[PDB]
Amino acid sequence: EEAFTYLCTAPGCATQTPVPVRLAGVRFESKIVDGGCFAPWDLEATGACICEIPTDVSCEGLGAWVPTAPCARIWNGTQRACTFWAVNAYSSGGYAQLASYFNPGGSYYKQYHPTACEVEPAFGHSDAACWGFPTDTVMSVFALASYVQHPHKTVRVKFHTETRTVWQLSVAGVSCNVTTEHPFCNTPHGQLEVQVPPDPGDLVEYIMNQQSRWGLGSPNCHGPDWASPVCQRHSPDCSRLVGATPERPRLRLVDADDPLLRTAPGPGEVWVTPVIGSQARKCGLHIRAGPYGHATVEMPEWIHAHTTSDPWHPPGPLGLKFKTVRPVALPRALAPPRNVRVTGCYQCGTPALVEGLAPGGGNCHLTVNGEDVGAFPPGKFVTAALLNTPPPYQVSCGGESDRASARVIDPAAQSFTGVVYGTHTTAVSET
Amino acid sequence: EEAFTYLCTAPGCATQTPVPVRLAGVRFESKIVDGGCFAPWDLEATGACICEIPTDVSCEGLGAWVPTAPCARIWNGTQRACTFWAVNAYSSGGYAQLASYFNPGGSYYKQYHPTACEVEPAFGHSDAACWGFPTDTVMSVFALASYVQHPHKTVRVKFHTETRTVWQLSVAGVSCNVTTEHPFCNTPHGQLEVQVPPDPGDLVEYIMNQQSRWGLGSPNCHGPDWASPVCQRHSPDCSRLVGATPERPRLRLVDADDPLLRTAPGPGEVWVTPVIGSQARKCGLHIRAGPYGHATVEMPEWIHAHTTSDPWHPPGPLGLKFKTVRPVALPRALAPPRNVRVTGCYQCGTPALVEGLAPGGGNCHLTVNGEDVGAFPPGKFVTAALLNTPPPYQVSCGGESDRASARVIDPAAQSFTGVVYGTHTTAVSET
Amino acid sequence: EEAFTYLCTAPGCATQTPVPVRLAGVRFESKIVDGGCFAPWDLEATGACICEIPTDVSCEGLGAWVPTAPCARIWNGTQRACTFWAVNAYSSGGYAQLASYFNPGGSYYKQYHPTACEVEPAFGHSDAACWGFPTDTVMSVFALASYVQHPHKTVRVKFHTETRTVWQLSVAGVSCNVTTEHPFCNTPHGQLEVQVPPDPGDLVEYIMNNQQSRWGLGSPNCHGPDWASPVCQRHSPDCSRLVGATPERPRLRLVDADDPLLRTAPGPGEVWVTPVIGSQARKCGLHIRAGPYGHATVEMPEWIHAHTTSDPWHPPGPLGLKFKTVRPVALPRALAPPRNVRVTGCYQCGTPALVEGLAPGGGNCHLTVNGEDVGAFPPGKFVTAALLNTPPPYQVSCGGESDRASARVIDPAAQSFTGVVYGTHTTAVSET
């Protein structure tokens, strides 16, 4: 009574002989690796052309010239850079506003007018933008740039490893979920072995706030998916930044007729150009910024073109091998396992240690919150299992469950384990 | 008869019983991901030691001292950096050539002599290289560096995903191509099931221009293949640069006796040293450059040692399982599919959406330009398929073909989808 | 007499019907890719606040103020950066110690006092830290930073590709090592086909030193929780020379105690130095704030303990035991050694090496290169591309006696430097 038939993988696909088999659906199993939050590196810049020598180089102190909302937002950004250039200083009077106070680095100006920004002389640059001064022309330029994290551009990313396509079948109305790990279905006619195509490899789950979008791969940061937020800003706890980070933006004062404007600014470069005012004692500012990676990411557009609504699976078909063989039924232990300890992390990519005592009566088909971690003979057991569920852990051999003792941390905590975050401070003492 | 035999994977390998099976060849199937153009980061530098104070800091303006072809080529390079140092300026006369015009940043000089290059004073540096001046010694130094894309070093790269080794067999003269997805063959009066080793994982195809060279992996930029052009400069459309880019080169004027010369320059650093001239009012220049990645890539040499002429496959053997069973013949629809729409991209790594209507008379074994995308029951179908062929798309169920409606972009267009390329400009208005 | 049973993967797991099958152990096979040495990017900084204008800006020359051991260690580091700032110079006398010698870049000072460090004026910065001078207050600041490679933080890393879980079985007292490549076993009068789960994909072997191996599952993924892996950082293929991605030279800044910049944290690679007012006359302390690479300092024993396992990972199973009455067709095999065998390329590198020679007559040669299976070949000329895990010399066999092959095979470190010219690229521009 041995038979063979091909079963297609599309909805509606079904075989009739010798035993009717219907394709009920297609899903997937995996070992989740939660990377936390990802976002593009968004270089944002602001500033002002000022026909004055301001005494307070800050968003509040420059409120009369610098756009209020962009200043506050860019000031709170990552790798902030700001420069205040004195184009034409006070000829007389004032308070630490003469040209002499604008030495390279502006320490003389900073003594009387403290600021978190760099202060530089720019005497020699065109002061033509500031007109309508009968005796003393005054001109300064402010530029501010940082990598701003836009909430609408932030995505939660879960990497899917050890991916297994689940071919959900109905074998004469009896549910059977086949994978490369478990390709057999018990049938009274005899065992059914399903020949399945290989698994699709690693997947990328982009979580939008809740909808999931799918990527196939690591991702590949060297191919068409180079602009993926995964290839950019990484925050494991959706608060603190880790790993690769661009340098602080390079701010430059570039006059309108400077030959440098014939070329484009490089990544992280911000060029500011004073615009001649239509009004007396006023001027505009044109900003040219070189974005990270040579392009600005448009998140809804990137997600729509670089992801799918469902995870990818091979086209099939599935090879249905109907056999006359009847599997030997082994006696299973149904009592819960004892003294179970779970140590490590979950959804992290590092297998957690699961140890305990398997009871008598047969092999314990051990589950940790419903997750199959293998079968163990009666007695002490030790296993390294990749867990997808958080603590508390309910442990079972197939029957009743028991509460295991756990010392398990979350993926964000794992990302900060083995590292000391932040500024490293040291003091050199006098002899 | 129910029989088993091992078949080796080498040319000439063949088994005779119960039915002869000959290894006709070994090839591969994959889902192509075209990354476009890749090249190493080649830091190239030029310049000149000048016994004059030039008024035009450009390739044309410095034509009397700077080598012509290297200047023009390096000027057009990526992340260009250039500095003009005044070692010994005019003591009197001239036009914006006195020491006073060389303030830090050289804005006073630039006002009368515009240049895209940085201008800096260098008055405490040795002027010994410029001799033969009776009254006023004049000396300047020019340095120019960028990341030049050498055409002989540029490689077209296609990433191969979902790789399937194709074991081309001849079963009693009948062609059968076995993979992990399709391991069955028809024998005169039965069925052959071929046990195959796993697929080799992702491949890297280096396209020399036309010859193809093969890499096994992602590649791994952290191992012996670290210097792969894939790990470096990425241009998806073989014109515009994307992603990771080195900073602009750091140019330094370093005197012959400076202790800094006892150490090597870091990556992207360019040190220029004036060489005492054999002729009056003339001098040479010695350039020390720290290449990106601490080494200069020799492309024909790298390709020869880090790639193979053919894709890698496991050694085998193949397990030939001879069965008396015959597959159940299902009715196949031969009429072409109706209203087929193809949306997305090809050779991009994102599955394209294929939708239409499968005709009556059985399952439609759907092909998109000969590529198998699965079998579908009659009626409406929807599938996410990774396409290797460009539009137009010929769609078939196994018989006659029909032209499908398509909105499919190329891999280069996909790489620029979801991003806004180039300089981001913003204008700050006057109040 | 067709039979089926599930075999669990735990040590001691066994089935008795129809043929006794015992799980002896679990091992793995792979194609090794030796990456050499890996370590975190450790930004280390030192310096001193000096109530003097030193004439020798070096560790020895600044021995009276700069901590001796940190100076020497940081000076020998990667991407070294050092700056000497003149806060308050000599008002009169001295030797190239006046304010005029401290022009931007300090070339005038450097003419008489050479140094590998940057020299900068800092005359508008607070000199309050240096007191007890009746006539001429003198003050300078030195800062030194680099990426120091700590030996206790350096790990040897071998990447494992084409990984195959080895299920070691005892089939009716006979050893059988089942993999996805070789899933068949002989039973007394039949054949056992073992259904196995897929292989776990690539592995990362972290080697510390006596010598202990720790295991990672993956590439690794530098974008997830294992971002701080030394593999994601400093790479030295020959455990001597650095290659690839390298941070920029540290950015040293002299930052006064009341500067608003101190309300923010320094960025990666940034080093901010702040003079501390001395409790003694003509002396001052220095406070250093450094932004580590990757925003955190890696603690190696702690990272390894949490981000690795003692053994490589394998799926939970069970294994599907398919008992058949079938017997494999015995093909005649050549036992004589292969001749004129040449091996070219590299080993433990990730690039298949070329193996060519002459297989003898009288059957297929089941070729081994230092015990490694590279496939079976019919009599005569053969050519194969094989990933080798063993170094030269190469002993070649068809299953019987072995012969010495001729080899032109380089090690993984040599492969990493093949196709590249290491170090400084020099060029000369001639006079016209």
Ligand SMILES: *[C@@H]1O[C@H](CO)[C@@H](O)[C@H](O)[C@H]1NC(C)=O
């Ligand atoms: C198959 O999967 C579905 C969905 O998870 C589940 O409801 C069903 O019980 C499973 N069947 C078996 C036999 O495990």
Ligand SMILES: *[C@@H]1O[C@H](CO)[C@@H](O)[C@H](O)[C@H]1NC(C)=O
């Ligand atoms: C096997 O592949 C070859 C080469 O692509 C082709 O000519 C042949 O028709 C294929 N055979 C079958 C049965 O598909």
Ligand SMILES: *[C@@H]1O[C@H](CO)[C@@H](O)[C@H](O)[C@H]1NC(C)=O
């Ligand atoms: C620094 O390097 C030199 C030269 O290799 C060596 O002589 C010296 O011992 C090293 N010092 C330290 C502390 O590593």
Ligand SMILES: *[C@@H]1O[C@H](CO)[C@@H](O)[C@H](O)[C@H]1NC(C)=O
């Ligand atoms: C199985 O592996 C062990 C350990 O490597 C080895 O000693 C034994 O000979 C192997 N058995 C076979 C049949 O290859």
Ligand SMILES: *[C@@H]1O[C@H](CO)[C@H](O)[C@H](O)[C@H]1NC(C)=O
């Ligand atoms: C450019 O930026 C400035 C200041 O940040 C203004 O917001 C301006 O309106 C911007 N341009 C546009 C139209 O977005």
Ligand SMILES: [Ca+2]
């Ligand atoms: Ca003025």
Ligand SMILES: [Ca+2]
């Ligand atoms: Ca002169």
Ligand SMILES: [Ca+2]
């Ligand atoms: Ca003094």
Ligand SMILES: [Cl-]
């Ligand atoms: Cl079978």
